Amino acid sequence: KARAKAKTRSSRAGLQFPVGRVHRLLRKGNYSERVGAGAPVYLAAVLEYLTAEILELAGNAARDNKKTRIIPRHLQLAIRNDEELNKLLGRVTIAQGGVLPNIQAVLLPK
Amino acid sequence: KARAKAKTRSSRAGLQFPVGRVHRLLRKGNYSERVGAGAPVYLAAVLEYLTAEILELAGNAARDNKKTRIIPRHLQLAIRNDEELNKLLGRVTIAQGGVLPNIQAVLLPK
Amino acid sequence: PHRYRPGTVALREIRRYQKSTELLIRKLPFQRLVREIAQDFKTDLRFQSSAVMALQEASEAYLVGLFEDTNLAAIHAKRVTIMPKDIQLARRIRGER
Amino acid sequence: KPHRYRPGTVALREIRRYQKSTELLIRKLPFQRLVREIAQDFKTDLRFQSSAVMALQEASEAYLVGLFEDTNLAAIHAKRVTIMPKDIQLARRIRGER
Amino acid sequence: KRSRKESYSVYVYKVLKQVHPDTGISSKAMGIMNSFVNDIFERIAGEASRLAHYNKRSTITSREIQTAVRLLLPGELAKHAVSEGTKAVTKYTSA
Amino acid sequence: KRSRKESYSVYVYKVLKQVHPDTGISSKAMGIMNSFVNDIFERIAGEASRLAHYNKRSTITSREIQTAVRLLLPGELAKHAVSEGTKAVTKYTSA
Amino acid sequence: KRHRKVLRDNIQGITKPAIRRLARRGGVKRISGLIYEETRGVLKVFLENVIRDAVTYTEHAKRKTVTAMDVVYALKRQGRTLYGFGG
Amino acid sequence: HRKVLRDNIQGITKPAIRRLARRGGVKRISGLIYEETRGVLKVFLENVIRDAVTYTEHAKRKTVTAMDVVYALKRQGRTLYGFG
DNA sequence: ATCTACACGACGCTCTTCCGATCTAATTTATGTTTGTTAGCGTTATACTATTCTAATTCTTTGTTTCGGTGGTATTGTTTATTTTGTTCCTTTGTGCGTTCAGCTTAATGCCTAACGACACTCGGAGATCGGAAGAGCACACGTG
DNA sequence: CACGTGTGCTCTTCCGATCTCCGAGTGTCGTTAGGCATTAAGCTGAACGCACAAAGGAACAAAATAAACAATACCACCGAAACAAAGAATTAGAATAGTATAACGCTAACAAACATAAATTAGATCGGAAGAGCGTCGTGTAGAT
């Protein structure tokens, strides 16, 4: 059957993250019997904002380390240096990520 | 309509805790689309065993304190003295329960 | 005069308030403190009395557990007096700072 | 006359190097046999994926590094620079694990 | 006229008479035991639900409850609980 | 022939080109960002589900997601996220 | 007929005897003098963390009052589960 | 395949523990740290592997997946990024 | 060894909270039907285990020697126990009204089902940032003048 | 302290490569369009509980004071730990080989959802009593001298 013009729900909201996949994962994730229409749009916008907040500092760490490619060390450097992303991911371990360069001031030589 | 003999599902399993109420709270609690028949019987048996494990030590604390009635202090004394109930309820606050009598050995007089 | 030694009735208070199960903050300062704090998130906020009782019980339990951890961190430093650095170390190893 | 450093200097250099680098610090072949020994208490004849022992290695290394950070805090609090067993036990008490 | 305030108070009273037929209970302690049962029911049911979600089953069965009890309860409590659960499941399946 | 391994890899690549059009990403870092999105989706969706369970609603709506973001994300992130969410909800409701 | 009251500086109602008793329950024998202001700040940031979550819970409920269930849920949210007030 | 292992805790060596300590910023390490750290790592591994063997016994498998380790760490509040 | 301040211990006087009796709604269960979920069995390919060989990287031994922990001694603020006088908190007694909160509608909204087509996944090649190696130079740790 | 010595890392430059970037199928999962059940929004009366107010008792808090004890600063000595050169040994990587197992794919049986009526059970509502909260005298414990 001939339809109207096809347009994804992530394009109506101006998003890069999929609205339909987040709606599918909400409906098949056993959270409620019903999921409203603004819930996946809101959640995908929050997820795209958080992923952009991560990558915008990970690219800065990669550019500071003279690198044109993001490795897990750059993600750990972006997360543990931000003051408020460290509260969101305080109980999270990153593989091949290492720790921050952090020597206590009493251990430094005299 | 005339039925057979009525008999609760908690009486078939020899339980005091309700099988039907735990089945209702599992079906209306948004955990899965399906709940098997042995799941509420198993969960009610585990809950009755845990509540009996609590009360059997709370009554001993009440009888040790010359009391014929359980107060919240007796529940706290039963929980924090058991070695393995304290792992189950380590992040739990009991109201009007107080703490264990616990003075460190360095603070005692000489 | 029958002045005791320093720390003796402190130990008796340790035993008494460890035996006791009451609230140790008075309810009228704590109700006004919660009413002061909650204004910044919403003005004209009525409270259930049981809600302020729950806030009081939880705040006192949090502070008693933090003072237990503080006492451990001060015993480790070969001291009997708790200091604000002991509270800071307990809050840091606990993962709150 | 040969050349020797002072105690703590090469230690601080390795602190900076292992804080800078992201390689695993324990060899994989002892760790596979240790995980295989530990899992025999719960089930015998257990095969392991390579990725499973790798994930166990990353998580165990991260747990040990975070515990040594808390241990170093608890040792600096005791006016010392070395770490002692009571520092690890105090960190595990305040963390609420033992 | 209002909503009926469902609870677990009569079942903690039934179990207490099986254990201590001479000891009574308060109302505050009854509310604490109510919140105790309501919290461990939430723990076991949520962890069994995520067990069913991991293995891509759409049914919480007695195996999921047994595995969740083994994951949650420590030490002696887990094996005493799986005995108390399995014996009740067999006693329910005989009838 | 096997099952299709669904992921979030192309969307993290789409967002990275909007932010840094000169910087690439690894495969390990792509898997870490995948687990990051999959973990915060679980946090926000579970906390919105228990928000709907507390107030006895049977629908997770945009209000529940906004309240769950306000409960979960700290500080500046929460208000920047509710701006980014509300502006997308209005842009989706205009179309 | 309006007497709207807004409160200020109620942190001093938690007195130094009231803090010394809270430390006495925890097993503290000696308490330094600088403890009390740090303890008031710790209690204030803890109550801010709990009360912000509770006010969020009760304005999602579209209620102008804070119930005790909102405090219970705000404490469970932070992993500080409280028994004796419903749940 | 008739193989039973014993005393593999010494395979994680003192030079392999000093590097784990110096990643965490420890400048000086006393000598009683090593057997203690082997015991601490052992009890952590017994907790995580007991949870993972429970996870793969529920799955009716005889091998341990990396996803079972990831879920066993998520259960303890030690979420791991990098393995699914 | 002696004295005095709490602290349980026993007894008694109201009391108020706990336990029993009744009434009714509502939530459990019995029976039957329908569906859709997972156990059973077979298979293949694949990743795990076991093994050889050589390289080679790291572990272990041992010999310095440095410095950090640890015990001990001294001193000065300072926290604690106590008493007295406000001071405010608790308890009661009263009032007014504001905000929950249940109840009754219906309007919007989400679920469902099916057809269609765009999108992400997998496979498969091309290239290029980067891992590794050679040579030189500087920050810097450390040692005599 | 302040200048020469030598080392570790950094920097600069060059070569394979393997890990990343793009191209081409292709199922599959998101999109669209009605249509239907149902959940939540809006309006409203009852009353519940919260806020505010007054008054008196008291209970706790604030302020001054002696002093006893604990934190802290400093110093001497040991013993243990870091650093380093050398040989062993154990690990790493590629390569063969065998195969247990696990991830698919049908098949079906069996177990669970759904609906309805009957009735049993649990919560609400009073009311009688009994464990207990509290006031008064007793010895004991125990701490200070």
Q: Which residue has the tokens 């107060």?
A: B71
Contact C94, D94 (CB under 8 A): yes
* Contacting subunits of G (3+ beta carbon pairs below 8 A): B, C, E, F
* CATH (domain of E87): 1.10.20.10
Q: How far is CA H55 from the centre of its chain?
A: 16
How many degrees, rounded to 5, is the angle at CA C64 between CA C60 and CA C66? Answer: 115
- What are φ and ψ of residue A93, in 5° steps? -100, 130
What's the domain range around F78? 1-95
CA-to-C1' span, A105 to I66 (A):
22
Measured CA to CA, the distance from residue B4 to residue G49 in angstroms comes to: 57
Whether C83 and C67 have beta carbons less than 8 Å apart is answered as: no
Backbone φ, ψ for residue B35 (5° rounding): -130, 125
Q: Please give the Cα distance from A34 to A26 (Å, whole number).
A: 9
φ, ψ of residue B34 in degrees (nearest 5) = -130, 145
Query: Which chain I nucleotides are covered by protein, judged by CB under 7 A?
Result: 4-9, 17-19, 25-31, 37-39, 47-50, 58-60, 65-70, 78-83, 88-90, 98-103, 109-112, 115-122, 129-130, 141-144
Reduce the DSSP state of residue D48 to 3 states and report it. Answer: strand
- The answer to whether the beta carbons of residues B28 and A30 sit under 8 Å apart is no
Structure tokens given for C3: 């002045």
Helix (H, G, I), strand (E, B) or coil at G38: helix
Identify whether the C-beta of residue C52 lies closer than 8 Å to the C-beta of residue C37: no
- Contact partners, residue F47, CB within 8 Å, separation at least 6: F68, F71, F72, G77
Q: Under 8 Å CB-to-CB from G7, ≥6 apart: which residues?
A: C32, C35, C36, C39
Asked if H30 and D82 count as a contact pair (C-beta separation under 8 A), the reply is yes
Copy the structure tokens of residue B70. 């359980």
Task: Report the SS3 class of residue E89.
Answer: helix
Question: In the block, which residue shows the tokens 């906020």?
Answer: C45
Question: What ranges make up the beta strands (E) of B22-62?
Answer: 34-35
CA-angle at D13, arms to D7 and D18, nearest 5°? 125
> Which residues have C-beta within 8 Å of that of residue F48, sequence separation ≥ 6?
A31, A39, F60, F64, F65, F67, F68
Tell me the C-alpha distance between F78 and F66, whole Å.
Answer: 9
Q: Six-digit token pair at H23?
A: 């990643």
Put simply, whether A107 touches D (Cβ < 8 Å) is: yes
Q: What is residue G85's three-state secondary structure?
A: coil
Integer Cα distance of A82 and A90 in angstroms: 11
The Cα–Cα gap between E82 and A40 comes to 40
Contacts of E11 (CB under 8 A, 6+ apart): B16, B17, B18, B48, B51
Can you give the residue ranges of every domain in chain C? 1-97
The residue among A99, H27, E20 whose CA lies nearest residue E29 is E20
Cβ–Cβ of A107/D81 closer than 8 Å? yes
What one-character DSSP code corresponds to residue H12? S
Cβ-contact A70, F94 below 8 angstroms: no
**Residue type at F22?**
D
Two structure tokens written together for F25: 């990403």
The separation, in Å, between residue D27 CA and nucleotide I57 C1' comes to 11
Pairing of strands C81-82, F59-60: unpaired
Strand J bases, protein C-beta under 7 A: 6-10, 19-21, 27-33, 38-41, 49-53, 60-62, 68-72, 80-85, 90-92, 100-105, 111-113, 117-125, 131-133, 143-145
Residues 41-80 of A with CB under 7 A from strand J: 69
Whether B93 has its CB under 8 Å from any CB of chain C: the answer is yes
DSSP string, F68-87: HHHHHS-THHHHHHHHHHHH
DSSP C81: E
Query: Residue D50, Cα to own-chain centre: how many angstroms?
Result: 21
Distance CA D58, CA D67 (A): 14
Give the dihedral sign, CA F17/F20/F26/F31. Answer: negative
Q: Go through B10-19 and write b for each residue having 16 or more CB atoms within 10 A of its CB, e for each that does not.
A: bebbebbbbb
Element (H, E) at D42: none
Helix E28-54 × helix B19-27 angle, to 10°: 50
Q: How many Cβ atoms sit within 10 Å of the Cβ of residue D6?
A: 8
User: Is residue A105 less than 8 Å (CB to CB) from chain D?
Assistant: no
The set of residues, in sequence order, having a beta carbon less than 8 Å from that of A99 and lying 6+ positions away, is A76, A80, D19, D65, D69, H23, H24
Reading the block at residue F10, the tokens are: 């192309």
Vertex B75: Cα angle to B71 and B81 (nearest 5): 140
Tell whether F31 is within 8 A of chain H (Cβ): yes
The answer to whether A44 and A10 are in contact (CB under 8 A) is yes
E38 vs G: CB within 8 A: yes
Query: Exposed, middle or buried: residue B56 (CB in 10 Å: 0-12, 13-18, 19+)?
Result: middle
Supply the CATH number for residue B11's domain: 1.10.20.10
Of all nucleotides, the one whose C1′ comes closest to residue A36's CA is: I110
Tell me how many residue pairs between chain B and chain F have CB atoms under 8 A apart: 3
Q: Which residue is nearest to nucleotide J124 (CA to C1')?
A: E4
- Please give the sequence-ordered ranges of beta strands (E in DSSP) within chain G, or none if there are none: 30-31, 65-66, 81-83
- SS percent in chain G: helix, strand, coil, step 5: 55, 10, 35
Resolution in A: 3.2
Residue D70: closest C-alpha in chain C? C93
Are the CB atoms for D68 and H20 separated by under 8 Å?
Answer: yes
How many Cβ atoms sit within 10 Å of the Cβ of residue E74? 14
Give CA–CA dist A58/A67, Å, rounded.
Answer: 11
**Partner-chain contact C73 D90, CB within 8 Å:** yes
Matching residue, tokens 């409620």: A32
Contact assessment for residue B12 and residue E91, using Cβ atoms and an 8 Å cutoff: yes
Instruction: Choose among A96, A80, A98: nearest CA to H24.
Output: A98
Distance between D19 CA and the closest CA of chain A, angstroms: 5
- The answer to whether residues A94 and F32 touch, using CB atoms and an 8 Å cutoff, is yes
Distance (Å, rounded) from C-alpha G42 to C-alpha G63? Answer: 29
User: Greatest CA separation found in chain G?
Assistant: 52
Tell the CATH superfamily of the H1-84 domain: Histone, subunit A (1.10.20.10)
- Alpha helices (runs of H) in chain A, residue ranges in sequence order: 9-12, 19-27, 38-64, 72-81, 85-88
Shortest CA gap G56–chain F (Å): 7
- Whether chains C and F touch (3+ CB pairs under 8 A) is answered by no
Between CA D66 and CA D71, with CA D67 as vertex, the angle to 5 degrees is 120
Q: Which of C24, C54, C84 sits opposite G21 (nearest CB)?
A: C24
For residue G66, what is the DSSP state? E
Rounded to 10 degrees, the C-alpha dihedral F18/F24/F29/F34 comes to: 40
Distance from CA of G2 to the nearest CA of E (A): 34
CA of G68 to C1' of J53 (A): 26
Is there a contact between B69 and E24 (Cβ–Cβ < 8 Å)? Answer: yes
Contact criterion met (CB < 8 Å) for G87 and E38: yes
Q: Do G85 and E31 touch (CB under 8 A)?
A: yes
Q: Does any CB of chain D come closer than 8 Å to the CB of residue A95?
A: yes
A61 φ, ψ (degrees, to nearest 5)? -65, -40
Phi first, then psi, for residue B7 (nearest 5°) are -155, 125
Convert A50-88 to b/e letters by CB count within 10 Å (16 or more is b).
bbbbbbebbbbbbeeeeeeebbbbbbbbbbbebeebeeb
Contacts of A30 in chain E (CB under 8 A): 49, 53
Matching residue, tokens 């029958």: C2
* Half-sphere exposure (Cβ direction) of D25: Cα atoms closer than 13 Å: 27
Cα A104 from Cα D74, distance rounded (Å): 12
* Rounded Cα gap, residues B84 and B90, in angstroms: 10
Both tokens of residue A52?
């952009």
Q: Strand pairing of C81-82 and H63-64? A: unpaired
Considering all nucleic acid strands, name the nucleotide whose C1' atom is nearest to the C-alpha of residue E17.
I19
Spatial distance between the Cα atoms of E62 and A40, rounded to a whole number of angstroms: 34
Task: Please tell me whether any atom of strand I lies within 7 Å of the Cβ of E14.
Answer: no
Distance CA(F44)–CA(F64), nearest Å, equals: 9
C-alpha distances (whole Å) from A66 to each of A52, A56, H65 are 21, 16, 37
- Is residue D24 packed enough to be buried (19+ CB in 10 Å), middle (13-18) or exposed (0-12)? middle
| DSSP state at residue C25 | S
Helix, strand, or coil (residue E30)? helix
Kindly state whether A98 is in contact with chain D, defined as any CB-CB distance less than 8 angstroms. yes
Do chains G and C touch by CB distance (3+ pairs < 8 Å)? Answer: yes
Q: What are phi and psi of E20, to 5 degrees?
A: -130, 95
| Fold for the domain defined by G1-87 | Histone, subunit A (1.10.20)
In this structure, what token pair is assigned to residue E69? 């009890």
Rounded to an integer, what distance in angstroms lies between the CA atom of residue A29 and that of residue H71?
A: 17
Using alpha carbons only, give the angle A12, A15, A21 rounded to the nearest 5 degrees: 90
User: E4-23 burial, b for 16+ CB within 10 Å, e for fewer?
Assistant: eeeebeebbeebbeebbeeb
**Contact C45/G65 with Cβ under 8 angstroms?**
yes
CA angle F30, H58, B17 (to 5 degrees): 120
The Cα H12–Cα H19 span in angstroms is 11
| 3-state DSSP helix/strand/coil % of chain E, to nearest 5 | 70, 5, 25
Dihedral (C-alpha) C55, C56, C61, C66: value to the nearest 10 degrees?
90
Q: Do G87 and E35 touch (CB under 8 A)?
A: yes
Q: What DSSP character marks residue D25?
A: S
Among F9, F28, F32, F35, the strongest candidate for a mutation testing the H interface, having the largest count of H CBs within 10 A, is F35
**Distance in angstroms (rounded) separating the CA atoms of residues E27 and B59:** 15
For F56, counting Cβ atoms within 10 Å of its Cβ (0-12 exposed, 13-18 middle, 19+ buried), the class is: exposed
Token pair listed for C25: 């903050």
- Phi, psi dihedral angles at A28 (to 5 degrees): -100, 15
C1'-nearest nucleotide to the CA of G64: I99
Which residue do the tokens 């050349």 mark? D3
- Closest-CA residue of H relative to F30 is H82
Separation of alpha carbons E87 and E69, rounded Å:
15
Contacts of A110 (CB under 8 A, 6+ apart): none
Take residue F63 and report the two structure tokens written for it. 């209000």
Inspect the interface and report whether the beta carbons of H54 and E67 lie closer than 8 Å. Answer: yes
**In angstroms, how far is J118 C1' from B7 CA?**
13
Instruction: Give the contacts of H32 (CB within 8 A, at least 6 positions apart).
Output: D84, D85
Contact A107 D12 (CB under 8 A): yes
Question: In angstroms, rounded to a whole number, what is the distance separating the alpha carbons of residues A20 and H80?
Answer: 27
CA A42 – CA F67 distance, rounded (Å): 11
Mention every residue, 6+ apart, whose C-beta is less than 8 A from residue F20. Answer: A55, A56, A59, A63
Which alpha helices (H) appear in chain C, and where do they start and end?
8-19, 27-37, 49-76, 84-93
> Is chain G touching chain D, with at least 3 CB–CB pairs below 8 Å?
no
Backbone Cα Rg of chain G: 16
Please spell the DSSP secondary structure of F17-53, one letter per residue: HHH-TT-EE-SHHHHHHHHHHHHHHHHHHHHHHHHHH
Q: Residue A70 and residue F23: Cα distance in Å, rounded?
A: 7
β-bridge mates for residue H28, sequence order: D82
Task: Give the orientation angle of helix E62-72 with respect to helix E28-54, to 10 degrees.
Answer: 110
Rounded distance between C-alpha atoms, residue G76 and residue H17, angstroms: 38
Among chain G residues, CA nearest to B104:
G27
Overall number of domains in chain E: 1
Specify the amino acid at residue A37: A
Quickly give B21 CA vs I24 C1' distance in Å: 20
Return d(Cα E23, Cα E29) in angstroms, integer. 13
